[PDB]
Amino acid sequence: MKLTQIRNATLVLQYAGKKFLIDPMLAEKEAWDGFAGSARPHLRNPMVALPVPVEDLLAVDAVILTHTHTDHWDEAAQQAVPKDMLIYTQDEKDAALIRSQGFFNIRVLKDENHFVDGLTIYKTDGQHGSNELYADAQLGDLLGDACGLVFTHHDEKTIYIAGDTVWVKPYVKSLQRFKPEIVVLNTGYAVNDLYGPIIMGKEDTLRTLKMLPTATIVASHMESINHCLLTRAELREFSLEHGIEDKILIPADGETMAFSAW
Amino acid sequence: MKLTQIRNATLVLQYAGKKFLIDPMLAEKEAWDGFAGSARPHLRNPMVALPVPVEDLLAVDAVILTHTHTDHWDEAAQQAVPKDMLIYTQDEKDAALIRSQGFFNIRVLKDENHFVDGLTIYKTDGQHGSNELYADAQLGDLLGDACGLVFTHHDEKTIYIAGDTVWVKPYVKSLQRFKPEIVVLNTGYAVNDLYGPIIMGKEDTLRTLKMLPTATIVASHMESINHCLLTRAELREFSLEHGIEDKILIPADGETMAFSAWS
Numbered sequence: 001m002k003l004t005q006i007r008n009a010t011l012v013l014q015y016a017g018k019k020f021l022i023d024p025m026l027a028e029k030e031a032w033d034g035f036a037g038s039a040r041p042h043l044r045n046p047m048v049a050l051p052v053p054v055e056d057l058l059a060v061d062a063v064i065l066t067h068t069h070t071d072h073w074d075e076a077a078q079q080a081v082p083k084d085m086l087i088y089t090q091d092e093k094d095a096a097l098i099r100s101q102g103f104f105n106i107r108v109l110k111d112e113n114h115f116v117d118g119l120t121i122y123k124t125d126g127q128h129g130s131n132e133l134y135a136d137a138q139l140g141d142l143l144g145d146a147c148g149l150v151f152t153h154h155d156e157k158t159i160y161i162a163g164d165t166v167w168v169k170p171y172v173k174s175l176q177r178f179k180p181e182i183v184v185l186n187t188g189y190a191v192n193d194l195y196g197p198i199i200m201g202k203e204d205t206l207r208t209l210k211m212l213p214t215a216t217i218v219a220s221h222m223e224s225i226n227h228c229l230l231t232r233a234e235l236r237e238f239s240l241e242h243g244i245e246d247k248i249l250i251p252a253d254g255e256t257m258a259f260s261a262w
Numbered sequence: 263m264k265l266t267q268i269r270n271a272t273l274v275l276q277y278a279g280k281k282f283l284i285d286p287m288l289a290e291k292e293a294w295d296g297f298a299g300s301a302r303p304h305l306r307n308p309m310v311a312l313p314v315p316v317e318d319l320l321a322v323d324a325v326i327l328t329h330t331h332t333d334h335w336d337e338a339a340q341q342a343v344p345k346d347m348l349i350y351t352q353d354e355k356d357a358a359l360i361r362s363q364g365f366f367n368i369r370v371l372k373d374e375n376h377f378v379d380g381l382t383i384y385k386t387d388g389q390h391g392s393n394e395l396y397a398d399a400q401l402g403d404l405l406g407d408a409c410g411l412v413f414t415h416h417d418e419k420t421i422y423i424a425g426d427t428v429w430v431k432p433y434v435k436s437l438q439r440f441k442p443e444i445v446v447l448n449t450g451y452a453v454n455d456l457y458g459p460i461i462m463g464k465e466d467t468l469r470t471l472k473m474l475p476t477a478t479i480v481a482s483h484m485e486s487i488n489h490c491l492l493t494r495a496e497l498r499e500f501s502l503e504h505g506i507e508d509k510i511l512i513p514a515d516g517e518t519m520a521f522s523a524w525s
């Protein structure tokens with residue numbers, strides 16, 4: 001069991017024999033523009049370069065795509081990844097636009113996804129914006145859906161990749177139901193101009209340990225996209241103030257993290 | 263259809279040749295006598311009496327409970343509804359509770375409930391509170407889960423009882439998916455002291471109709487318990503203001519509305 005932080009929410013995961021590339025964003029440093037209608041629009045994306053070359057990321061059994069925002073799936077990854085690569089997608093909408101980009105080996109993943117060997121991937125709901133944001137029609141379609149992944153196995157520990165979501169009840173029900181020993185949160189604190197936080201921040205790391213004390217949080221989706229304000233040093237400082245230093249890991253780009261089972 | 267507003271979220275729904283009683287609150291006017299030792303016990307609930315006798319309410323094929331909050335399922339209803347009645351519950355814990363209160367003919371609503379007759383009943387996920395409220399683990403369990411209900415059938419228009427939820431995207435996706443001609447909202451505007459509104463209000467009437475302008479809104483869950491701060495008169499005054507007065511139905515207690523697909 002080896003979870004590795006690449007850049008933003010791009011992750012490499014070894015889990016029960018198989019390997020997964022989660023949300024591959026592989027543009028060069030400052031290739032495309034900053035997000036309009038968000039914080040720090042002057043900063044170009046991505047802010048940081050990749051910690052390792054592209055060929056190392058392609059050596060993977062399947063790509064998993066939580067949603068099709070540009071920081072999770074860019075023009076570079078469309079060019080770079082083979083069209084016969086096994087892409088897991090959130091829904092038919094996502095699969096349809098990936099199909100029109102030239103890809104064809106696609107499995108639209110669903111609430112429960114079982115493998116004979118004992119692997120089980122679950123697809124969990126979130127909310128990529130505030131209750132106020134989704135009252136708007138236009139911004140609703142733009143922020144859209146963005147799932148979280150729960151990987152279960154008998155030989156391995158349960159890990160929960162929560163995805164681009166703010167604190168909503170479906171996140172709470174997912175923690176209670178799956179009781180995950182490891183939790184990966186997108187803790188960038190990305191600010192929309194007129195509706196505020198579209199994903200989690202520092203406070204959501206406290207809230208989750210209050211909800212699930214035995215869990216160990218891995219903070220991702222940070223220092224990469226222009227609107228993500230919450231830096232690594234600030235979260236690390238927030239850890240110390242609440243007495244939760246060893247329970248919050250803040251991996252650097254390229255940092256592999258290992259977790260045993262029994 | 264024939265939807266009858268009873269009082270609060272209590273209503274009877276004649277749909278596809280079958281009658282249901284959704285969320286029965288059957289206590290008399292100001293009759294909730296639950297007491298431990300309060301110095302200033304509020305004796306306002308229920309604010310209004312039943313507009314019809316209890317006998318008329320029970321002439322029904324099954325009861326449907328969105329959740330077990332007292333304003334949807336009180337002790338009076340737990341006594342008055344017979345134990346051999348078919349009760350449809352939201353999930354396993356509410357079924358267990360209802361079963362341990364003497365009832366034995368209980369069923370749990372799945373996410374989809376396709377019956378051979380052609381009637382389909384979809385269970386919806388809401389949020390009974392703000393995002394902040396559910397960060398509190400104590401108030402998470404207290405407000406808990408509370409499901410919406412869609413009813414689907416040919417020969418009949420599609421109706422969505424949203425239930426005790428504030429505006430979250432699972433509510434928006436339900437309007438986008440099922441596309442109901444009738445959306446029944448719980449517009450009490452009950453508010454938590456520090457964490458803001460716990461159910462829908464006047465604002466949520468307009469935001470739906472912008473999303474789905476064909477639809478007709480039936481207002482409900484108000485002027486029954488004192489904690490619901492929205493008045494009949496205020497919502498009508500709000501509807502006249504934004505030019506939607508004849509699309510916002512605000513029925514009296516006991517009023518029945520007909521909704522036919524053909525005639």
Ligand SMILES: [Zn+2]
Pocket residue numbers: 067069128146164
């Ligand atoms: Zn996103």
Ligand SMILES: [Zn+2]
Pocket residue numbers: 009069071072164221
């Ligand atoms: Zn993102």
Ligand SMILES: [Zn+2]
Pocket residue numbers: 329331390408426
């Ligand atoms: Zn309630």
Ligand SMILES: [Zn+2]
Pocket residue numbers: 271331333334426483
């Ligand atoms: Zn209620």
